[PDB]
Design a protein around this ligand. Structure first.
Ligand SMILES: [Mg+2]
Lengths: 109, 109
């Protein structure tokens, strides 16, 4: 099941579309990997538990910049902007990014 | 193990909307894939307008107003790829907003 695409389609349907997602893929980090990343300075040294790898499309440069910034201003998120490309056939930018979320979420167990 | 449904809700709530606002906030978003049998039974039962669903998202959320909740529900009815089953909503008089629950079905497309 192409989960990443279903999750993207579901997120794009939520009414507000300047930034649409193509794929949203989640993984949990080992404590060792989280340790390495915090020390490497990625995600501003926050202790990330979960990473969402994103591929998306932005109708303008400025919409992409707002999207990236939203994940920089929170104590619970970090973002690594991996890249963007102009798509002249569709008049938009494709882009990729990894969003880290700090550990400590609780669930029943 | 990892409470994915909370990390995904938080990620979705972080995606910026115009004005910095969030008229619907998600608290839990769980996904699951349907066996062919279950999709066949749901379709015959008329759930999700008889579309044959491939993935189902179970949602717990909060809506700023009755009108925000109605817009959220309708977003998932006006698309050929989605159906929604609205389970319920309640006014939280401590906060002056609505909690709600719903299931969203997604087609193979
Ligand atoms: Mg709720």
């Amino acid at each position: 099941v192409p989960w990443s695409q279903y999750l993207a389609a579901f997120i794009n349907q939520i009414p507000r579309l300047e930034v649409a997602l193509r794929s949203v893929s989640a993984r949990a980090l080992s404590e060792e990997e989280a340790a390495r990343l915090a020390q490497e300075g990625t995600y501003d040294g926050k202790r990330i538990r979960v990473e969402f790898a994103l591929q998306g499309e932005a109708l303008s440069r400025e919409a992409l910049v707002r999207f990236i910034r939203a994940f920089e201003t929170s104590p619970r998120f970090g973002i690594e902007f991996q890249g963007a490309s102009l798509d002249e056939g569709r008049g938009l930018y494709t882009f990729s990014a990894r969003v880290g979320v700090t550990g400590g979420e609780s669930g029943a167990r």
